[PDB]
Paper text:
Non-structural protein 5 (NS5) is the largest viral protein, comprising the N-terminal methyltransferase (MTase) domain and the C-terminal RNA-dependent RNA polymerase (RdRp) domain. The RdRp domain is essential for both positive- and negative-strand RNA syntheses during replication. The structure of RdRp is often compared to a right hand, and is composed of three subdomains: thumb, fingers, and palm. The thumb subdomain contains a so-called priming loop, which extends into a double-stranded RNA binding site, and is hypothesized to undergo a conformational change during the de novo initiation of RNA synthesis.
In order to understand the inhibitory mechanism of RK-0404678, the crystal structures of the NS5 RdRp domains from DENV2 and DENV3 were determined in the complex form with RK-0404678 at 2.43 and 1.97 Å resolutions, respectively. The DENV2 RdRp structure revealed two RK-0404678 molecules bound to two distinct sites (Sites 1 and 2), while the DENV3 RdRp structure showed only one molecule of the compound bound to Site 1. The DENV2 RdRp structure revealed the second binding site (Site 2) for RK-0404678. The benzoxathiole ring of RK-0404678 interacts with the side chains of Val507, Ser661, and Cys709 and the main chains of Glu510-Gly511. A comparison of the DENV2 RdRp structures with and without the bound RK-0404678 revealed that the compound binding induces a local conformational change in the RdRp. While Tyr607 on the α16 helix faces the catalytic center in the absence of the compound, it is flipped in the opposite direction upon compound binding. A cobalt ion included in the crystallization conditions occupies the space left after the flipping of the Tyr607 side chain.
Numbering used by the authors: 271 to 412, 418 to 455, 473 to 601, 604 to 791, 801 to 845, 848 to 886
The structure:
């Protein structure tokens, strides 16, 4: 089942740009994706990640930690792409049963209606898009060189209009994904997607206020508070099951339910969004590279159901909200059979959604595929037939083994973190985020771009340091490492583009984020120094693999390393920041 009436125009346009080498490789490796052909291509990508030499020189004890080192070994060569494709992306998900589909359709229709109560969809503009391009951007493959180049060249916008008018007659020609697993599109295709669906992000449809379950806009320093509030609900344990490869488990049915947001639109906006949904989401064309004994080729493949990562405009959050409501329903015995929803069962679901729907959403904190649920009681743990039949198979657990929850919200994993209460010297109680400090250091030692000069490398380092001092100040090693990086990088250099991304005094930012603007901090008295700001317990702070001897030596000689970095940056002026205790 590949529908060439929808994808043929895209495939033929690519075939015609490489007619000489175009061919059908009878030994292609694709099993659940439809394969259309290959052509010869120049190898792109690389098999190493680039190391941030500034962060590395100031974090020398971590040169021997395995987690840290391994993180610097990403493979975007054809070899790497094909490795991840075979293991992760080339999977099939069964179609949900009839009953499951009915639950999803009812629940999705209800959810769009709740999200739309206080919001109205709208088209986003070329001007909105262009302003966002002048900053951090969603990721498209880039004929110009940068996104900021394309937005000014008005020929770029003629191409947009060309594709847009095809979209307006239900045809698609250039919206092709590239697996260079992350999927890129031409910036023009990204614009059309933004124009149709950007309102979901820009108008904050998944903020906690509008969606009850969501946390769009919250910010790491707020998530722990949000978890602790959810824990105040009456109910069972708190559950936080990860889905194995969520993007690959998005079904065609999921995509059709997300599309019901178009029922809330009108005019050409509805037509454009319908094009994004039917032409680019439910009928995708993907380019992947593959090594062959004859050099690297590009494969053209297609598939209807999965999702490709930029975010997903809240659609992953939407679908997870829907999926977790249905698991709540199943736990509460609202329905009995995935096989067939009886007429009286469809009415119960409708009643349940009308009666307790909003309350059940607020038992949840959901960010894309990341969810925390505090259900009515622990029947939830073994309500599994809808979850599995929807394809949202739980990671690292037997299919019918019941979920394990937690009674202590400080043990619940959410958004790659745990959250802890932390007592200040004056007795006020902070809720702070926590995650393995060897991961944080490993990610800081990776320069997110290839071929970078030392200034941008130093500014990326400073960005992590300021983030550490805001978010992970309670970790002794990170506070010290942040101090060194900030001492080593000229004080007026701007961190690369969030609260840590200026040259504001970071104590000023700390006070604003954790005291002044913290809705869960009643006493608005600021702190007057970093010595006033506490650490986690020395025990629980140990979490790190580094030896105590190499940490002590690192701490004792840290100024030697700082000066070494200062010398390579240049005859500049630097500030010696308050040394961590
Ligand atoms: C937009 C929002 O507030 O939701 C999230 C989800 C995951 C996450 O991981 C971080 O580092 S911050 C963060 C925020
Ligand atoms: C706890 C500590 O002293 O670490 C930092 C980190 C970043 C920063 O940015 C400034 O201007 S001050 C400052 C201190
Ligand atoms: Co050719
Ligand atoms: Co080529
Ligand atoms: Co996974
Ligand atoms: Co169909
Ligand atoms: Co209309
Ligand atoms: Co999302
Ligand atoms: Co009740
Ligand atoms: Co950052
Ligand atoms: Co509050
Ligand atoms: Zn298109
Ligand atoms: Zn911890």
């Amino acid at each position: 089942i590949p529908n060439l009436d929808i994808i043929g125009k895209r495939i033929e346009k690519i075939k015609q740009e490489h007619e000489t080498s175009w061919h059908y490789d009878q030994d292609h490796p694709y099993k659940t994706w439809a394969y259309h052909g290959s052509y010869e291509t120049k190898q792109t990508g690389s098999a190493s990640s680039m190391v941030n030499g500034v962060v590395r020189l100031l974090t020398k004890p971590w040169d021997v930690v395995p987690m840290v080192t391994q993180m610097a070994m990403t493979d975007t060569t054809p070899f790497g792409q094909q490795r991840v494709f075979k293991e992760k992306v080339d999977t099939r998900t069964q179609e949900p049963k009839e009953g499951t589909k009915k639950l999803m359709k009812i629940t999705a229709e209800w959810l769009w209606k709740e999200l739309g109560k206080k919001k109205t969809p709208r088209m986003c503009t070329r001007e909105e898009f262009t302003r966002k391009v002048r900053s951090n951007a969603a990721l498209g493959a880039i004929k110009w060189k940068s996104a900021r180049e394309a937005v000014e060249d008005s020929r770029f916008w003629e191409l947009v209009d060309k594709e847009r008018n095809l979209h307006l007659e239900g045809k698609c020609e250039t919206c092709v994904y590239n697996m260079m697993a992350i999927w890129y599109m031409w910036l023009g295709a990204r614009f059309l997607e933004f124009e149709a669906l950007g309102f979901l992000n820009e108008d904050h449809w998944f903020s906690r206020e509008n969606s009850l379950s969501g946390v769009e806009g919250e910010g790491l320093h707020k998530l722990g508070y949000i978890l602790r509030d959810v824990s105040k609900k009456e109910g069972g344990a708190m559950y936080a099951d990860d889905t194995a490869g969520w993007d690959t488990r998005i079904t065609l049915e999921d995509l059709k339910n997300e599309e019901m947001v178009t029922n809330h639109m009108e005019g050409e906006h509805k037509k454009l969004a319908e094009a994004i949904f039917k032409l680019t989401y439910q009928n995708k064309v993907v380019r992947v590279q593959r090594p062959t004994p004859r050099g690297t080729v590009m494969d053209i493949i297609s598939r209807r159901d999965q999702r490709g990562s930029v975010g997903t405009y809240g659609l992953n959050t939407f679908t997870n909200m829907e999926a977790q409501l249905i698991r709540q329903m199943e736990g509460e015995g609202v329905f009995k059979s995935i096989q067939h929803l009886t007429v009286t069962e469809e009415i119960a679901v409708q009643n349940w959604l009308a009666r307790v729907g909003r309350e059940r959403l607020s038992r949840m904190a959901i960010s894309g595929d990341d969810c925390v649920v505090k259900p009515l009681d622990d029947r939830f743990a073994s309500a599994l037939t809808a979850l599995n039949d929807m394809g949202k198979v739980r990671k690292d657990i037997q299919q019918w083994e019941p979920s394990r929850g937690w009674n202590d919200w400080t043990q619940v994993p959410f958004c790659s973190h745990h959250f802890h209460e932390l007592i200040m010297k004056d007795g006020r109680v902070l809720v702070v985020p926590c995650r393995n400090q060897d991961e944080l250091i490993g990610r800081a030692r990776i320069s997110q771009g290839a071929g970078w000069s030392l200034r941008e490398t130093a500014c990326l380092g400073k960005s992590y340091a300021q983030m550490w001092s805001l978010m992970y100040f309670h970790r002794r090693d990170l506070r010290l490492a942040a101090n060194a990086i900030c001492s080593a990088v000229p004080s007026h250099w701007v961190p690369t583009s969030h609260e840590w991304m200026t040259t504001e005094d970071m104590l000023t930012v700390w006070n604003r984020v954790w005291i002044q603007e913290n809705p869960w901090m009643e006493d608005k008295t600021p702190v007057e120094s970093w010595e006033e700001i506490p650490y986690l317990g020395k025990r629980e702070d140990q979490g790190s693999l580094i030896g105590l001897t190499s940490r002590a030596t690192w701490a004792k000689n840290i100024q030697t390393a700082i000066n070494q970095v200062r010398s390579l940056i240049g005859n500049e002026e630097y500030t010696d920041y308050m040394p961590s205790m």
